[PDB]
Amino acid sequence: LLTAEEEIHYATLALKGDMEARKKMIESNLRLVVKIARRYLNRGLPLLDLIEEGNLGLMKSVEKFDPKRGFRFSTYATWWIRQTIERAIMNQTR
């Protein structure tokens, strides 16, 4: 778990392309993916698939997270994880 000070430090580096900072941010939020994924069960995708799609969002969330927008990383990551899951559920309809 990252302090606010640590999170902003890593976020500033991550925004500039620092992969170690991006890794630190993702590793601190791996649990968030499973927790969110569980909320989308029984919608046509099994849990492992929901985790996989959620993971896509968590990874995307460290590519351009700007602390200056005023939101904490776990918030921005939550939005992204929900979005990639919801996208995957949409894709079940062709």
Please report, as ranges, the residues that interact with Na ion according to CB under 5 A.
Answer: 3-5, 71-72, 75
Q: Closest distance between Na ion and the C-beta of residue 26, in Å? A: 18
Return contacts of 85-91, CB within 8 angstroms, 24+ apart.
85/36, 85/37, 85/40, 85/50, 85/53, 85/54, 85/57, 86/40, 87/53, 88/45, 88/49, 88/50, 88/53, 89/40, 89/43, 89/44, 89/45
Tokens of 59: 């990874």
Q: Closest distance between Na ion and the C-beta of residue 31, in Å? A: 17
Query: Which residue lies nearer to Na ion by CB, 5 or 90?
Result: 5
Query: How many residues are listed for the chain in this entry?
Result: 94
Q: Closest distance between Na ion and the C-beta of residue 93, in Å? A: 32
Query: Which residue lies nearer to Na ion by CB, 36 or 45?
Result: 36
Query: Which residue lies nearer to Na ion by CB, 3 or 42?
Result: 3
Q: Closest distance between Na ion and the C-beta of residue 82, in Å? A: 15
Query: Which residue lies nearer to Na ion by CB, 75 or 91?
Result: 75
